[PDB]
Design a binder for this molecule. Structure first.
Ligand SMILES: [Zn+2]
Ligand SMILES: [Zn+2]
Ligand SMILES: [Zn+2]
Lengths: 168, 121, 237, 46, 64, 54, 391
């Protein structure tokens, strides 16, 4: 729905504002860590909760809005194929990509790609993919989601091999 | 805050020696028989929490670096609003996320650090 | 080594790698990457000392502390006290051909280093050059419509060519290492200063410092992934 | 404790700045103040 | 390699329409869709047949 | 925690600080060696007070 | 009339990309690299060990492509026939040799890459490609070896001539190392590793720095290496390292280094210290001192210079590396990112074929001084090259 989309897009806009305060807050040195956890580790743990909480609300939003005759929903309800995360990412938002448990890292000096300026910890700069699949990814998103994806292709081959040796 | 001395003749480094009699600090050389009286009584310092290097890189041409973000903050000195800004250039795990701004007219450095203990940088 | 690194942007495809053991170690060049063949550094070396470069045997750090270190293939050849002059003229010379196009030159402004590499094996790609100015107001891409026509006249006659684009300084080849010192626009319209509910969200130019712009983002892909329709609507695996 | 700055000042009891910078090193690292070896962080959770 | 004889899906002959389709474009200047509908290929299955043919034989004939 | 005092946030801190390993190092801002020859007064303006207690 | 100065838009990209691809095609990485081999690397392989102990090689010519026949003999080869015949789309190499006294010419077959300048197909037109039975869409960039089409796959390696710093894990007695892999475009492709090591972990007692030179069997205190290079006084030594007189933290880290070389106060001594660690007992002082000089002048940072007057240049570059090691130890700079693609180099046909034909030209030139060390008094093995390539 057009109305669902606007609600999804605000859902997402609010999370980016939460992020923006937590940012300004750490930027002024006002933020506290708590107990053996670094300031920057605190900051990241908080922005990633924010961004995940957004992805999720956005996706609950889309689920609700689809009707019983929605055939994706009809599969999920039966149990035969698909789950919430799939609705969500197709229809509402794909969300934060990650490599080794963390937001996309600065592999250029102080930046994730040359299209950004230095010291950028914002959602977009570190791998939040705001768009759904339907809508399409931007180029930067596209590349961070492939980073993501590659890590599971790798992790998958390592799993399969580790698992088989265990099993024997 | 140690400052380092060398032999006026040899240019090798100088080492501390107590003038047992008169209770004073000398630096001697181990190569010449040169000596000189010590300028301070501090011979050694170890900072466990340091700030040396937060500001490394502020250079005449900082502003021609197209990668740096810019803002419209005003400076304490020039009242100008042409800055570039960065984070701490120490590369610590345990660093703050505070910002360092460089006035591009008057070259004054200042921070967004509301608990500023810092005079210099 | 197996992971997709940020630095492979534009140079290797982010999608094409085999499954299994070779995952991540076999790669494929992006459709527009190229690889340097190597070129001799001696005229650049000679040039630099024509332009002020002071030799190492003269260098006295305590007396010239603000000095930029100049490196060429890996070798410290000396020190320069206005690298900005030197850098504007190096670039001008490579945008005209006098320095070969496949040479790489990086000034690191805060690190007070200027490094140049004329060796083979470096992989690179082209981008549009963005220049203030104009006269007309903002920063603008150096190519303009009249260039494009000359291009399309040539296509249709089947003489203004890719090289004519290098020679006139409209396009320049950039490798990973020089990529670190630039700021690139993703689409030409990030340069100019009620949206469609069905378009994707894009996060605007909060940038007035661009130095270059992508030719097209779909050029990050390699041969194989260039045949998938709408890959930007697919889960990455 | 009242004192505003916390300062420890130590001296030994003939070449004497080596003992000092090793002594310093013992200070800093092999002196258990509180706690139990091997346990690096501890976190409360409810 | 050469126009297929019929629409794979509906059986309509379509192998007697290639010369005409190509005449209709280069000689009478119609856009591909108007041209197809003039040959009476009106279901999307037949349209796909002509529109996406690729006459490889034209290359194959260049060898000796 | 001990059966009584298991929902005292403040008896769990105490517990935390009795266990968590702590060295001089974790509390120490900087160390210095000075030549300060005369152990009954001092070259350091600030510790006049400290010395003044012996 | 549409303004010639008007700014472009997104669609107009495709015009510039088409132009790239009319020029370059899709496989220029292959072509450009073979072309440069042919045109420049080849000849440069010849002018390194040109001369022996006299006999000296000058110019190369590269044939178009041809075959040694079964009977009726030597013949232009097009690629369609080499495929079909299990042939090897090769050309031959002729040098220009000279005898002179002190006490044309075939040398081989080079497999040639399709659509290189040397291959017939690069000048051909579309009709010419059909007569030749080659598809006008084929793009080249591969070789035909015994009838089979063979491609070389680019190989990725690290660059040489780059300083890298690394921390090292926990049980190790060194905590950081800085490393370069010194190398050559001119000389050979001889690869010395310098390492610069900081000993003792974070607050050990006297953390020191020492470096690993080639053939020298002990790590050498860095100030001893500065003295063997002629930079004597602590003061001048530390100014090649710490280019900022108020960084009292770096300089306090180089004090243990000053102690560690305190015993050696002049260059002769310093060389000797080093020479002894590279020679057997019994070797005389002068010969030791010269051993150390030759190691430093030739096998220590040889990407700098391998010739005599070049000691200020090496010193500074050693200094720089130790500055880089310390800046990491001091937690001012991060350990170097071994994954940054810019520090990688990918090796294609040219370079791959020059590692080979250099190696092999140095066999071939060693079979020449055995027509000549057993000559008690134009007699050359061609095939060693031909078949080393093909093999
Ligand atoms: Zn002296
Ligand atoms: Zn100011
Ligand atoms: Zn049909």
């Amino acid at each position: 729905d057009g109305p669902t989309m606007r609600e999804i897009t605000e859902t997402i806009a609010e999370a980016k504002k939460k992020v923006l305060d937590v940012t300004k807050e750490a930027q002024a040195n006002l933020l506290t860590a708590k107990h053996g956890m670094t300031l920057r580790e605190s900051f990241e743990d908080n922005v990633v909760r924010f961004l995940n909480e957004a992805r999720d609300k956005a996706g609950r939003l889309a689920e609700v809005n689809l009707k019983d005759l929605n055939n994706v929903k009809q599969m999920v309800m039966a149990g035969s194929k698909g789950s919430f995360i799939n609705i969500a990412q197709m229809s509402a938002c794909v969300g934060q990509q990650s490599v080794e448990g963390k937001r996309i890292a600065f592999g250029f000096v102080d930046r994730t790609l040359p299209h950004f300026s230095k010291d950028d910890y914002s959602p977009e700069s570190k791998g939040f993919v705001e768009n759904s699949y339907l809508r399409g990814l931007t180029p930067q998103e596209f590349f961070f989601h492939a980073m993501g994806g590659r890590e599971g292709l790798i992790d998958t081959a390592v799993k399969t091999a580790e698992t088989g040796y265990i099993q024997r | 805050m140690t400052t380092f001395r060398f032999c006026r003749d040899c240019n090798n480094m100088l080492y501390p020696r107590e003038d047992k009699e008169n209770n004073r600090l000398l630096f001697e050389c181990r190569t010449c028989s040169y000596v000189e009286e010590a300028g301070s009584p501090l011979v050694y310092r170890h900072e466990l929490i340091t700030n040396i290097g937060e500001t490394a890189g502020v250079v005449q041409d900082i502003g021609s670096d197209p990668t740096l973000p810019r803002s419209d903050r005003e400076c304490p000195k020039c009242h100008s609003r042409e800055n570039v800004f960065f984070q701490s250039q120490q590369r610590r795990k345990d660093t703050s996320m505070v910002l360092f701004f460089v006035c591009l007219s008057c070259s004054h450095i200042f921070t967004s650090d509301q608990k500023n203990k810092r005079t210099q940088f | 080594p197996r992971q997709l690194h940020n630095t492979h942007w534009g140079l290797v495809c982010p999608a094409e790698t085999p499954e299994g053991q070779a995952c991540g170690l076999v790669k494929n060049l992006s459709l527009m990457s190229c690889i340097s063949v190597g070129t001799d550094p001696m005229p650049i070396i000679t040039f630099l000392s024509e332009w002020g470069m002071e030799p190492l045997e003269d260098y006295v750090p305590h007396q010239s502390p603000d000095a930029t270190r100049v490196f060429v293939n890996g070798v410290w050849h000396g020190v320069h006290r206005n690298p900005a002059r030197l850098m504007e003229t190096l670039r001008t010379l490579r945008r005209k051909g006098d320095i070969n196009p496949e040479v790489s030159m990086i000034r690191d402004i805060r690190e007070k280093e200027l490094k140049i590499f004329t060796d083979a094996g470096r992989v690179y790609r082209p981008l549009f050059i963005v220049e203030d100015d104009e006269s007309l107001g903002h920063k603008e891409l150096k190519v303009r419509k009249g260039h494009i026509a000359k291009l399309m006249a040539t296509e249709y006659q089947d003489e203004y060519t890719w090289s004519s684009l290098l020679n006139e300084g409209l396009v320049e080849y950039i490798d990973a290492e020089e990529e670190e010192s630039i700021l690139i626009a993703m689409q030409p319209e990030d340069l100019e200063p009620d949206v469609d509910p069905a378009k994707r969200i894009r996060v605007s130019h909060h940038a007035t410092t661009f130095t270059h712009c992508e030719i097209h983002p779909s050029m990050i892909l390699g041969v194989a992934a260039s045949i998938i329709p709408f890959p930007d609507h697919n889960q990455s695996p | 404790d009242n004192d505003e700055k916390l300062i420890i000042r130590c001296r030994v009891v003939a070449e004497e700045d080596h003992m000092l910078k090793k002594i310093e090193n013992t200070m800093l690292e092999n002196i258990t103040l509180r706690g139990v070896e091997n346990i690096e962080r501890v976190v409360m959770m409810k | 390699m050469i126009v297929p004889v019929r629409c794979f899906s509906c059986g309509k002959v379509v192998g007697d329409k290639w010369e005409s389709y190509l005449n209709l474009l280069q000689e009478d200047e119609l856009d591909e869709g108007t041209a197809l509908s003039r040959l009476g290929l009106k279901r999307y299955c037949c349209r796909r047949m002509i529109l996406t043919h690729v006459d490889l034989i034209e290359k194959f004939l260049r060898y000796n | 925690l001990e059966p009584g005092h298991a929902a005292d946030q403040e008896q769990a801190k105490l517990i935390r600080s009795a266990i968590e390993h702590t060295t001089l190092k974790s509390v120490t801002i900087a160390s210095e060696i000075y030549y300060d020859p005369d152990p009954r007064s001092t070259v350091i303006p600030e510790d006049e007070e400290i010395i003044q207690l012996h | 009339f549409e303004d010639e100065s008007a700014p472009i838009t997104a669609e107009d990209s495709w015009a510039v990309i088409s132009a790239f691809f009319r020029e370059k095609g899709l496989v220029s990485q292959q072509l450009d690299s073979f072309n440069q081999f042919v045109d420049y690397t080849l000849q440069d392989i010849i002018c390194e060990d040109s001369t022996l102990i006299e006999i000296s090689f000058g110019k190369i010519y590269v044939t178009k492509p041809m075959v040694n026949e079964s009977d009726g003999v030597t013949h232009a080869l097009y690629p369609q026939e080499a495929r079909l015949r299990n042939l090897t789309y090769s050309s031959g190499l002729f040098v220009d040799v000279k005898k002179r006294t002190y006490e044309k010419v075939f040398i081989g077959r080079l497999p040639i890459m399709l659509r290189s300048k040397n291959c017939y197909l690069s000048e051909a037109t579309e009709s010419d490609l059909y007569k030749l039975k080659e598809c006008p869409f084929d793009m080249g960039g591969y070789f035909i070896i015994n009838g089979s089409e063979k491609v070389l796959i680019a190989q990725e390696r690290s660059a040489g001539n780059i300083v890298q710093v690394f921390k090292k894990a926990a049980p190790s007695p060194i905590s950081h190392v800085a490393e370069i892999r010194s190398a050559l475009e001119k000389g050979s492709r001889f690869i010395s590793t310098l390492q610069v090591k900081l000993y003792g972990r974070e607050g050990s007692s006297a953390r020191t720095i020492k470096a690993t030179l080639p053939y020298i069997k002990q790590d050498i205190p860095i100030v001893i290496i500065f003295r063997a290079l002629g930079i004597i006084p602590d003061g001048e030594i530390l100014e090649h390292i710490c280019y900022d007189v108020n960084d009292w933290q770096m300089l306090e880290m180089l004090k243990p280094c000053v102690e560690d070389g305190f015993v050696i106060q002049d260059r002769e001594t310093a060389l000797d210290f080093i020479g002894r660690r590279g020679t057997a007992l019994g070797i005389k002082k002068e010969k030791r001192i010269q051993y150390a000089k030759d190691i430093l002048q030739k096998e220590f940072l040889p990407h700098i210079t391998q010739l005599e007057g070049f000691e200020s240049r090496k010193a500074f570059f050693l200094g720089y590396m130790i500055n880089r090691l310390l800046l990491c130890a001091l937690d001012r700079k991060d350990q170097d990112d071994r994954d940054h693609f810019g520090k990688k180099r990918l090796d294609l046909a040219g370079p791959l074929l020059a590692q080979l034909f250099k190696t092999l030209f140095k066999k071939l030139t060693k079979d020449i001084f055995r027509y000549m060390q057993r000559t008690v008094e134009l007699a050359i093995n061609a095939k060693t090259i031909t078949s080393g390539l093909k093999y």
